[PDB]
Amino acid sequence: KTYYEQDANVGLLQGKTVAVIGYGSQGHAQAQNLRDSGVEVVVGVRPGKSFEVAKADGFEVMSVSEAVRTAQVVQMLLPDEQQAHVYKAEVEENLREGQMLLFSHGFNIHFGQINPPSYVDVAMVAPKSPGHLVRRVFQEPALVAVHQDATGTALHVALAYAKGVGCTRAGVIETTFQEETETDLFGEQAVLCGGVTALVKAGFETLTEGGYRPEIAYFECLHELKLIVDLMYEGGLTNMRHSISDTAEFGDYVTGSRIVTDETKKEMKRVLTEIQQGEFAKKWILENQAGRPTYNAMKKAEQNHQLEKVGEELREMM
Amino acid sequence: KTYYEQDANVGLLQGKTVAVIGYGSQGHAQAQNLRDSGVEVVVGVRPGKSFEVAKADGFEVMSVSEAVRTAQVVQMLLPDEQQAHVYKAEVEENLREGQMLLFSHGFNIHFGQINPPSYVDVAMVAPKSPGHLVRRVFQEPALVAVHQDATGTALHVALAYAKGVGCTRAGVIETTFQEETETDLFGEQAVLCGGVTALVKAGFETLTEGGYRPEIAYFECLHELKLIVDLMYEGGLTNMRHSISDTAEFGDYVTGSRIVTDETKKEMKRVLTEIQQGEFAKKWILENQAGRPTYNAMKKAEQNHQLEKVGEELREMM
Ligand SMILES: NC(=O)c1ccc[n+]([C@@H]2O[C@H](COP(=O)([O-])OP(=O)(O)OC[C@H]3O[C@@H](n4cnc5c(N)ncnc54)[C@H](OP(=O)(O)O)[C@@H]3O)[C@@H](O)[C@H]2O)c1
Ligand SMILES: NC(=O)c1ccc[n+]([C@@H]2O[C@H](COP(=O)([O-])OP(=O)(O)OC[C@H]3O[C@@H](n4cnc5c(N)ncnc54)[C@H](OP(=O)(O)O)[C@@H]3O)[C@@H](O)[C@H]2O)c1
């Protein structure tokens, strides 16, 4: 079930103020994506670089408290790990009846970090592409989930935000908060971000440990990957399989099963299971409560890897 | 050591005919990339779709025999597995003194499938991006290796082909036939093509087996990957790490090491070792001698996967 442009009409927002809370990777694009489509947008963000960048973007930047007080659609675009602190201290006491409490990721609702009152709609519009892309695509996809419907229009108000940001153009698939949260987390951990970077690093290190030039390993392990995945996007694995040599495609077939075994699949099911049982959520929540001793260290190590170091010069010249 | 535009001058090709043998993924782009840069190109290909597509591209399409006879630079752009059959039956007897025998992949020279005579230069220009990209980039990278220098200019004649195709613009890194062959094969088997498709499929199947909607699994496992890798290209892992949520980056750190273990690294070293010992080459060579009973079956299975099936509708609408 996919809602499209004919399923939505932003007219439900004519005269309705959308408070974009936060102004970062998603906050800046969606606020400017609503901007063109005649959506009256007010940005609620703490003072800082987001505050003045949204100001120079021509918006009405105010505090999170004042933004909730003067809006009917509160769109939560702070970091997932900051949303509960800001909510109870600045949003909750200012929520009124019929307001929409919107998210673009279901983490804080699904794992009980934000417990909204009963007189607001709780819905989600989760775009699949990062901000900058949502911005420029509109200037010329997403999931929708309705957690709590108090007005009877939360689905159609959320599709007016989908239409306002312009996701009904490409198309919006309906899901739930649980299903979006669980699969969004699993994808970036097991495949998109955790698996691929670990796979790129392992290949790179096998070549450098094999005596091969580090700059050569950078090309065939990381740099050629963009060209490999672009073809996958346009037409799946089949298209990418056809642009590459039969020598490459045959290597794919006989080597993929060696790299990703039945044991890798069993570990992915454990990753998924820990997501479903809130165990990852707990890990990330307590991680932030502890002052990120683990996130900061591992972030610095990943940036000190030779793949990232040798990657500097290589990208400069060309 | 990187040769650049100032290191090459196509003038060594003024009045020199470059015979592009084959007209496919690489043949069409390089022949048209040389075309604009005043390079006199003659295409030598068997009759068929490549023969008439090169004809409608305005070239002088002739047989492989006649192309070698009337050219001074023979560029071998047939499939790696067809080059030895075509060579001995159509190239070898027509090679003369001072001709350049060029490749864009070192497989057939490094694994002793083509044994060139002593009176020709043997060199390589291996572009890192597939054809279509080489074409349009020139209209507005590569490795260079010199296997046999008989004229004393094979390196500078090959950089005139690099300049003629336009790789000296971005830049060309010098390698050997062995090093290009070994790492090109290892990259596509362990990382780019074999590892990633196996990793995408394993994630997708974990979600579908987990009860999740197949269309939802397509987005977070395959479709979002292009947007993930694009960021990696522009600025390494660091850049991609920053566009994604801290919730995503923290998942990366704690999950990558679970998916790609010390055991995955040991298996990659076995993949590499089998490449270095000619064992993969033998496998692929005998595979083709047998009538591809293994390549065809596995190709059909990969195209019948649900990820590719569900991928159809999803890409259509948007
Ligand atoms: N591409 C994605 O990463 C992606 C995909 C879909 C949906 N989402 C979801 O969208 C939401 C945010 O995504 P994001 O990646 O856009 O977050 P972001 O890029 O980190 O933007 C962060 C914003 O939060 C503000 N902020 C941080 N702490 C604050 C506080 N204590 N009080 C007030 N404002 C504060 C920052 O202002 P300063 O500049 O002052 O810190 C900045 O404007 C998350 O729920 C995320 O899961 C993101
Ligand atoms: N992106 C890459 O795949 C890539 C990367 C760098 C370098 N290379 C290297 O470049 C070379 C070819 O790459 P490719 O991927 O361009 O090959 P390709 O796309 O398969 O092009 C195949 C060409 O070979 C011709 N051909 C096949 N069998 C023939 C025969 N028996 N006699 C004459 N012509 C024949 C085809 O003509 P029909 O249409 O008549 O079959 C077609 O023109 C290989 O050495 C490859 O490793 C490729």
mmCIF file of C-alpha atoms in Angstrom, chain B:
data_model
loop_
_atom_site.group_PDB
_atom_site.id
_atom_site.type_symbol
_atom_site.label_atom_id
_atom_site.label_comp_id
_atom_site.label_asym_id
_atom_site.label_seq_id
_atom_site.Cartn_x
_atom_site.Cartn_y
_atom_site.Cartn_z
ATOM 1 C CA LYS B 1 54.541 7.564 -9.222
ATOM 2 C CA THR B 2 51.629 9.116 -11.127
ATOM 3 C CA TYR B 3 51.938 10.252 -14.738
ATOM 4 C CA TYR B 4 49.786 13.283 -15.535
ATOM 5 C CA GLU B 5 48.734 15.355 -18.533
ATOM 6 C CA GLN B 6 52.163 17.020 -18.599
ATOM 7 C CA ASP B 7 53.806 13.562 -18.749
ATOM 8 C CA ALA B 8 52.039 12.549 -21.985
ATOM 9 C CA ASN B 9 51.533 13.895 -25.502
ATOM 10 C CA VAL B 10 49.274 12.175 -28.033
ATOM 11 C CA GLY B 11 51.542 13.492 -30.809
ATOM 12 C CA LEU B 12 53.187 10.062 -30.764
ATOM 13 C CA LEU B 13 49.869 8.941 -32.305
ATOM 14 C CA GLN B 14 49.604 11.629 -35.007
ATOM 15 C CA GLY B 15 49.350 9.505 -38.129
ATOM 16 C CA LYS B 16 49.185 6.331 -36.015
ATOM 17 C CA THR B 17 46.168 4.028 -36.305
ATOM 18 C CA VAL B 18 44.854 2.580 -33.033
ATOM 19 C CA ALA B 19 43.017 -0.680 -33.716
ATOM 20 C CA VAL B 20 40.394 -1.200 -31.022
ATOM 21 C CA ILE B 21 39.724 -4.949 -31.078
ATOM 22 C CA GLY B 22 36.268 -5.504 -29.654
ATOM 23 C CA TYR B 23 33.565 -2.907 -29.159
ATOM 24 C CA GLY B 24 31.798 -3.565 -25.854
ATOM 25 C CA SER B 25 31.761 -2.110 -22.334
ATOM 26 C CA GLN B 26 35.323 -0.799 -22.746
ATOM 27 C CA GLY B 27 35.673 -0.945 -26.529
ATOM 28 C CA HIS B 28 32.901 1.545 -27.272
ATOM 29 C CA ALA B 29 33.937 4.165 -24.702
ATOM 30 C CA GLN B 30 37.694 4.138 -25.309
ATOM 31 C CA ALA B 31 37.227 4.181 -29.089
ATOM 32 C CA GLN B 32 34.927 7.197 -28.758
ATOM 33 C CA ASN B 33 37.208 8.694 -26.087
ATOM 34 C CA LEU B 34 40.139 8.493 -28.489
ATOM 35 C CA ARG B 35 37.831 9.698 -31.289
ATOM 36 C CA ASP B 36 37.321 13.234 -29.955
ATOM 37 C CA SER B 37 41.036 13.659 -29.168
ATOM 38 C CA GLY B 38 41.981 13.409 -32.849
ATOM 39 C CA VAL B 39 42.983 9.746 -32.515
ATOM 40 C CA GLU B 40 42.559 7.828 -35.775
ATOM 41 C CA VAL B 41 40.641 4.742 -34.611
ATOM 42 C CA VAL B 42 39.813 1.575 -36.551
ATOM 43 C CA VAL B 43 37.596 -1.043 -34.895
ATOM 44 C CA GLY B 44 38.323 -4.723 -35.419
ATOM 45 C CA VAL B 45 35.395 -6.912 -34.395
ATOM 46 C CA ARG B 46 33.628 -10.020 -35.615
ATOM 47 C CA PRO B 47 30.312 -9.431 -37.414
ATOM 48 C CA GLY B 48 27.304 -9.040 -35.161
ATOM 49 C CA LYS B 49 25.734 -6.406 -32.962
ATOM 50 C CA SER B 50 29.121 -4.926 -32.029
ATOM 51 C CA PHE B 51 29.988 -4.787 -35.733
ATOM 52 C CA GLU B 52 26.917 -2.787 -36.757
ATOM 53 C CA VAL B 53 26.780 -0.644 -33.597
ATOM 54 C CA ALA B 54 30.363 0.450 -34.273
ATOM 55 C CA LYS B 55 29.391 1.049 -37.913
ATOM 56 C CA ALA B 56 26.451 3.279 -36.947
ATOM 57 C CA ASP B 57 28.896 5.033 -34.589
ATOM 58 C CA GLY B 58 30.668 6.211 -37.758
ATOM 59 C CA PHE B 59 33.797 4.048 -37.475
ATOM 60 C CA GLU B 60 35.693 1.883 -39.985
ATOM 61 C CA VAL B 61 34.633 -1.537 -38.708
ATOM 62 C CA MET B 62 36.680 -4.410 -40.139
ATOM 63 C CA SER B 63 37.762 -7.925 -39.178
ATOM 64 C CA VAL B 64 40.276 -8.484 -36.392
ATOM 65 C CA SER B 65 42.825 -9.700 -38.957
ATOM 66 C CA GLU B 66 42.577 -6.621 -41.172
ATOM 67 C CA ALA B 67 42.612 -4.353 -38.109
ATOM 68 C CA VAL B 68 45.934 -5.745 -36.872
ATOM 69 C CA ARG B 69 47.417 -5.569 -40.382
ATOM 70 C CA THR B 70 46.677 -1.862 -40.873
ATOM 71 C CA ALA B 71 47.349 -0.548 -37.349
ATOM 72 C CA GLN B 72 50.329 0.211 -35.133
ATOM 73 C CA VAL B 73 48.467 0.024 -31.793
ATOM 74 C CA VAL B 74 46.365 -3.096 -31.191
ATOM 75 C CA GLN B 75 44.114 -2.616 -28.154
ATOM 76 C CA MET B 76 42.658 -5.921 -26.909
ATOM 77 C CA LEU B 77 39.119 -5.266 -25.630
ATOM 78 C CA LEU B 78 37.499 -8.658 -26.119
ATOM 79 C CA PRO B 79 36.315 -10.660 -23.096
ATOM 80 C CA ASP B 80 39.309 -11.963 -21.157
ATOM 81 C CA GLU B 81 38.191 -15.533 -21.916
ATOM 82 C CA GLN B 82 38.021 -14.951 -25.697
ATOM 83 C CA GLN B 83 41.297 -13.044 -26.159
ATOM 84 C CA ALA B 84 43.573 -16.088 -26.473
ATOM 85 C CA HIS B 85 41.406 -17.825 -29.085
ATOM 86 C CA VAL B 86 41.139 -14.675 -31.208
ATOM 87 C CA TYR B 87 44.820 -13.829 -30.677
ATOM 88 C CA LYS B 88 46.448 -16.991 -32.029
ATOM 89 C CA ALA B 89 43.918 -17.296 -34.863
ATOM 90 C CA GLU B 90 43.756 -13.643 -35.968
ATOM 91 C CA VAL B 91 46.354 -11.353 -34.300
ATOM 92 C CA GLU B 92 49.644 -13.234 -33.910
ATOM 93 C CA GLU B 93 50.411 -13.879 -37.583
ATOM 94 C CA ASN B 94 49.689 -10.214 -38.429
ATOM 95 C CA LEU B 95 51.843 -8.588 -35.728
ATOM 96 C CA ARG B 96 54.765 -6.593 -37.154
ATOM 97 C CA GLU B 97 57.771 -4.838 -35.641
ATOM 98 C CA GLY B 98 57.226 -1.846 -33.365
ATOM 99 C CA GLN B 99 53.484 -2.410 -32.988
ATOM 100 C CA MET B 100 52.042 -1.877 -29.537
ATOM 101 C CA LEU B 101 49.955 -4.736 -28.102
ATOM 102 C CA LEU B 102 47.753 -3.026 -25.512
ATOM 103 C CA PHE B 103 45.439 -4.450 -22.843
ATOM 104 C CA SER B 104 43.117 -2.904 -20.275
ATOM 105 C CA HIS B 105 43.377 -5.940 -17.986
ATOM 106 C CA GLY B 106 46.497 -8.036 -17.463
ATOM 107 C CA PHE B 107 44.854 -11.466 -17.077
ATOM 108 C CA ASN B 108 45.875 -13.044 -20.389
ATOM 109 C CA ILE B 109 49.487 -11.827 -20.230
ATOM 110 C CA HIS B 110 50.080 -12.520 -16.528
ATOM 111 C CA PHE B 111 48.555 -16.029 -16.618
ATOM 112 C CA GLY B 112 50.386 -16.978 -19.818
ATOM 113 C CA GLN B 113 47.325 -17.170 -22.089
ATOM 114 C CA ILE B 114 48.872 -14.777 -24.634
ATOM 115 C CA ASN B 115 52.599 -15.124 -25.383
ATOM 116 C CA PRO B 116 53.454 -12.107 -27.545
ATOM 117 C CA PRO B 117 56.442 -12.129 -29.906
ATOM 118 C CA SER B 118 59.513 -10.117 -29.024
ATOM 119 C CA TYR B 119 59.209 -7.398 -31.695
ATOM 120 C CA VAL B 120 56.091 -5.722 -30.233
ATOM 121 C CA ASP B 121 55.565 -3.545 -27.193
ATOM 122 C CA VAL B 122 53.241 -5.024 -24.577
ATOM 123 C CA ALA B 123 51.660 -2.514 -22.212
ATOM 124 C CA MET B 124 48.433 -1.856 -20.352
ATOM 125 C CA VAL B 125 46.087 1.029 -19.569
ATOM 126 C CA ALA B 126 43.517 -0.273 -17.076
ATOM 127 C CA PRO B 127 40.776 2.319 -16.399
ATOM 128 C CA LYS B 128 39.096 2.046 -13.022
ATOM 129 C CA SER B 129 35.597 3.194 -14.139
ATOM 130 C CA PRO B 130 33.397 1.268 -16.600
ATOM 131 C CA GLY B 131 32.963 2.395 -20.183
ATOM 132 C CA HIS B 132 30.020 4.842 -20.269
ATOM 133 C CA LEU B 133 31.728 6.858 -17.529
ATOM 134 C CA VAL B 134 35.049 6.973 -19.413
ATOM 135 C CA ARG B 135 33.050 8.234 -22.405
ATOM 136 C CA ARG B 136 31.090 11.110 -20.862
ATOM 137 C CA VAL B 137 33.875 12.210 -18.492
ATOM 138 C CA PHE B 138 36.166 12.739 -21.480
ATOM 139 C CA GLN B 139 33.446 14.571 -23.443
ATOM 140 C CA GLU B 140 33.724 17.360 -20.828
ATOM 141 C CA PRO B 141 41.741 7.363 -13.401
ATOM 142 C CA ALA B 142 43.667 4.363 -14.762
ATOM 143 C CA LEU B 143 46.678 2.167 -14.110
ATOM 144 C CA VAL B 144 49.587 1.854 -16.548
ATOM 145 C CA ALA B 145 51.874 -1.171 -16.784
ATOM 146 C CA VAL B 146 54.617 -1.924 -19.298
ATOM 147 C CA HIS B 147 55.207 -5.642 -19.740
ATOM 148 C CA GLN B 148 57.630 -5.579 -22.689
ATOM 149 C CA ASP B 149 59.420 -2.533 -24.111
ATOM 150 C CA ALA B 150 60.898 -3.134 -27.566
ATOM 151 C CA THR B 151 60.827 0.443 -28.905
ATOM 152 C CA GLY B 152 61.968 2.298 -25.781
ATOM 153 C CA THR B 153 58.748 4.350 -25.856
ATOM 154 C CA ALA B 154 56.152 1.767 -24.753
ATOM 155 C CA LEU B 155 55.664 3.730 -21.530
ATOM 156 C CA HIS B 156 55.255 6.999 -23.448
ATOM 157 C CA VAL B 157 53.210 5.417 -26.238
ATOM 158 C CA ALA B 158 50.924 3.901 -23.585
ATOM 159 C CA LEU B 159 50.634 7.310 -21.919
ATOM 160 C CA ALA B 160 49.669 8.700 -25.329
ATOM 161 C CA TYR B 161 46.790 6.212 -25.243
ATOM 162 C CA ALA B 162 46.204 7.291 -21.647
ATOM 163 C CA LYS B 163 46.230 10.898 -22.852
ATOM 164 C CA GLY B 164 44.217 9.885 -25.924
ATOM 165 C CA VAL B 165 41.509 8.288 -23.791
ATOM 166 C CA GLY B 166 42.093 11.141 -21.348
ATOM 167 C CA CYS B 167 43.219 9.355 -18.179
ATOM 168 C CA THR B 168 46.258 11.612 -17.690
ATOM 169 C CA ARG B 169 43.715 14.335 -16.848
ATOM 170 C CA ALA B 170 42.668 12.659 -13.600
ATOM 171 C CA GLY B 171 45.980 10.790 -13.320
ATOM 172 C CA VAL B 172 47.596 7.417 -14.024
ATOM 173 C CA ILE B 173 49.445 5.264 -11.465
ATOM 174 C CA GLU B 174 52.172 2.923 -12.720
ATOM 175 C CA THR B 175 51.962 -0.759 -11.805
ATOM 176 C CA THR B 176 52.879 -4.152 -13.266
ATOM 177 C CA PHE B 177 50.812 -6.757 -15.090
ATOM 178 C CA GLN B 178 50.971 -9.103 -12.080
ATOM 179 C CA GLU B 179 49.933 -6.473 -9.538
ATOM 180 C CA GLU B 180 47.025 -5.170 -11.627
ATOM 181 C CA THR B 181 45.777 -8.694 -12.371
ATOM 182 C CA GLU B 182 46.032 -9.926 -8.782
ATOM 183 C CA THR B 183 44.348 -6.947 -7.093
ATOM 184 C CA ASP B 184 41.711 -6.366 -9.780
ATOM 185 C CA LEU B 185 40.573 -9.964 -9.329
ATOM 186 C CA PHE B 186 40.765 -9.881 -5.536
ATOM 187 C CA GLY B 187 38.779 -6.656 -5.240
ATOM 188 C CA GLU B 188 35.786 -7.775 -7.284
ATOM 189 C CA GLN B 189 35.734 -11.220 -5.694
ATOM 190 C CA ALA B 190 36.212 -10.431 -2.000
ATOM 191 C CA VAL B 191 34.756 -6.905 -1.753
ATOM 192 C CA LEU B 192 33.134 -5.020 -4.629
ATOM 193 C CA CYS B 193 31.074 -7.712 -6.354
ATOM 194 C CA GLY B 194 31.224 -11.001 -4.458
ATOM 195 C CA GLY B 195 31.267 -9.712 -0.903
ATOM 196 C CA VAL B 196 28.752 -6.891 -1.245
ATOM 197 C CA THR B 197 26.087 -8.790 -3.188
ATOM 198 C CA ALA B 198 26.404 -11.664 -0.710
ATOM 199 C CA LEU B 199 26.159 -9.158 2.157
ATOM 200 C CA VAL B 200 23.133 -7.383 0.654
ATOM 201 C CA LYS B 201 21.403 -10.716 -0.003
ATOM 202 C CA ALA B 202 22.121 -12.014 3.514
ATOM 203 C CA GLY B 203 20.664 -8.880 5.090
ATOM 204 C CA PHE B 204 17.616 -8.953 2.821
ATOM 205 C CA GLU B 205 16.978 -12.624 3.614
ATOM 206 C CA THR B 206 17.395 -12.075 7.354
ATOM 207 C CA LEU B 207 14.615 -9.482 7.175
ATOM 208 C CA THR B 208 12.287 -11.479 4.911
ATOM 209 C CA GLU B 209 12.821 -14.603 7.023
ATOM 210 C CA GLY B 210 12.170 -12.357 10.023
ATOM 211 C CA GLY B 211 8.623 -11.703 8.835
ATOM 212 C CA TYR B 212 9.297 -8.221 7.462
ATOM 213 C CA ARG B 213 7.811 -6.966 4.214
ATOM 214 C CA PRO B 214 10.007 -7.837 1.202
ATOM 215 C CA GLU B 215 9.545 -4.345 -0.233
ATOM 216 C CA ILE B 216 10.729 -2.782 3.030
ATOM 217 C CA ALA B 217 13.814 -5.007 3.099
ATOM 218 C CA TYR B 218 14.661 -3.871 -0.434
ATOM 219 C CA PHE B 219 14.994 -0.232 0.661
ATOM 220 C CA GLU B 220 17.205 -0.619 3.741
ATOM 221 C CA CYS B 221 19.419 -3.399 2.312
ATOM 222 C CA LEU B 222 19.916 -2.620 -1.404
ATOM 223 C CA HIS B 223 18.317 0.688 -2.395
ATOM 224 C CA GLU B 224 19.792 2.821 0.396
ATOM 225 C CA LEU B 225 23.248 1.400 -0.392
ATOM 226 C CA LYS B 226 23.864 3.732 -3.362
ATOM 227 C CA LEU B 227 23.337 6.764 -1.118
ATOM 228 C CA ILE B 228 25.635 5.197 1.473
ATOM 229 C CA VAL B 229 28.493 4.511 -0.939
ATOM 230 C CA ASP B 230 28.228 7.866 -2.752
ATOM 231 C CA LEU B 231 29.225 9.583 0.497
ATOM 232 C CA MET B 232 32.086 7.114 0.895
ATOM 233 C CA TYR B 233 33.442 8.023 -2.516
ATOM 234 C CA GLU B 234 33.475 11.783 -1.858
ATOM 235 C CA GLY B 235 35.292 11.650 1.478
ATOM 236 C CA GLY B 236 35.943 8.098 2.621
ATOM 237 C CA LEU B 237 34.234 6.343 5.505
ATOM 238 C CA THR B 238 34.511 9.547 7.559
ATOM 239 C CA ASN B 239 32.156 11.547 5.322
ATOM 240 C CA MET B 240 29.541 8.798 5.144
ATOM 241 C CA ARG B 241 29.822 8.403 8.921
ATOM 242 C CA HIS B 242 28.851 12.056 9.356
ATOM 243 C CA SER B 243 25.777 12.265 7.117
ATOM 244 C CA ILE B 244 24.173 9.325 8.948
ATOM 245 C CA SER B 245 22.683 9.583 12.418
ATOM 246 C CA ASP B 246 24.854 8.961 15.454
ATOM 247 C CA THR B 247 22.457 6.061 16.059
ATOM 248 C CA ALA B 248 23.586 4.664 12.692
ATOM 249 C CA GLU B 249 27.299 5.372 13.157
ATOM 250 C CA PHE B 250 27.277 3.699 16.578
ATOM 251 C CA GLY B 251 25.581 0.657 15.083
ATOM 252 C CA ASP B 252 28.306 0.559 12.414
ATOM 253 C CA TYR B 253 31.054 0.429 15.041
ATOM 254 C CA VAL B 254 29.487 -2.276 17.232
ATOM 255 C CA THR B 255 28.209 -4.449 14.343
ATOM 256 C CA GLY B 256 30.863 -4.360 11.593
ATOM 257 C CA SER B 257 33.270 -6.505 13.606
ATOM 258 C CA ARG B 258 30.478 -9.038 14.186
ATOM 259 C CA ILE B 259 29.723 -9.447 10.472
ATOM 260 C CA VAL B 260 33.307 -9.533 9.139
ATOM 261 C CA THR B 261 35.380 -11.588 11.580
ATOM 262 C CA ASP B 262 39.007 -12.730 11.824
ATOM 263 C CA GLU B 263 37.672 -15.807 10.028
ATOM 264 C CA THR B 264 36.368 -13.686 7.153
ATOM 265 C CA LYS B 265 39.833 -12.128 6.919
ATOM 266 C CA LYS B 266 41.445 -15.578 6.812
ATOM 267 C CA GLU B 267 39.101 -16.582 3.987
ATOM 268 C CA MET B 268 40.006 -13.411 2.049
ATOM 269 C CA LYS B 269 43.667 -14.375 2.313
ATOM 270 C CA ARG B 270 42.751 -17.767 0.834
ATOM 271 C CA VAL B 271 40.903 -16.026 -1.994
ATOM 272 C CA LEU B 272 43.983 -13.889 -2.612
ATOM 273 C CA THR B 273 46.325 -16.879 -2.400
ATOM 274 C CA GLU B 274 44.288 -18.801 -4.976
ATOM 275 C CA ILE B 275 44.469 -15.784 -7.270
ATOM 276 C CA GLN B 276 48.245 -15.560 -6.880
ATOM 277 C CA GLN B 277 48.728 -19.286 -7.585
ATOM 278 C CA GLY B 278 46.721 -19.224 -10.818
ATOM 279 C CA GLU B 279 44.085 -21.450 -9.215
ATOM 280 C CA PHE B 280 41.209 -19.075 -9.918
ATOM 281 C CA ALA B 281 42.532 -18.477 -13.429
ATOM 282 C CA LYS B 282 42.545 -22.241 -14.008
ATOM 283 C CA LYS B 283 39.005 -22.485 -12.612
ATOM 284 C CA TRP B 284 37.711 -19.747 -14.934
ATOM 285 C CA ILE B 285 39.682 -21.040 -17.946
ATOM 286 C CA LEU B 286 38.427 -24.610 -17.551
ATOM 287 C CA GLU B 287 34.966 -23.220 -16.767
ATOM 288 C CA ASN B 288 34.917 -21.665 -20.233
ATOM 289 C CA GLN B 289 36.415 -24.789 -21.811
ATOM 290 C CA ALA B 290 33.534 -26.820 -20.328
ATOM 291 C CA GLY B 291 30.790 -24.657 -21.859
ATOM 292 C CA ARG B 292 30.131 -22.590 -18.697
ATOM 293 C CA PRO B 293 27.900 -25.200 -16.980
ATOM 294 C CA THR B 294 28.596 -23.474 -13.652
ATOM 295 C CA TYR B 295 28.542 -19.811 -14.722
ATOM 296 C CA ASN B 296 25.181 -20.099 -16.512
ATOM 297 C CA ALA B 297 23.396 -21.912 -13.674
ATOM 298 C CA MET B 298 24.600 -19.512 -10.965
ATOM 299 C CA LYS B 299 23.805 -16.516 -13.178
ATOM 300 C CA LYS B 300 20.199 -17.690 -13.543
ATOM 301 C CA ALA B 301 19.829 -18.296 -9.800
ATOM 302 C CA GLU B 302 21.069 -14.794 -8.921
ATOM 303 C CA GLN B 303 18.528 -13.293 -11.344
ATOM 304 C CA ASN B 304 15.697 -15.361 -9.807
ATOM 305 C CA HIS B 305 16.326 -14.077 -6.281
ATOM 306 C CA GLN B 306 13.511 -12.244 -4.510
ATOM 307 C CA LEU B 307 15.752 -9.191 -4.017
ATOM 308 C CA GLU B 308 15.990 -8.842 -7.807
ATOM 309 C CA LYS B 309 12.316 -9.753 -8.265
ATOM 310 C CA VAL B 310 10.920 -7.310 -5.686
ATOM 311 C CA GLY B 311 13.470 -4.809 -6.992
ATOM 312 C CA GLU B 312 11.559 -4.576 -10.280
ATOM 313 C CA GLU B 313 8.356 -2.840 -9.175
ATOM 314 C CA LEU B 314 10.141 -0.669 -6.604
ATOM 315 C CA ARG B 315 12.428 0.944 -9.177
ATOM 316 C CA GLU B 316 9.694 1.387 -11.815
ATOM 317 C CA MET B 317 7.467 3.969 -10.146
ATOM 318 C CA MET B 318 10.251 6.272 -9.021
#
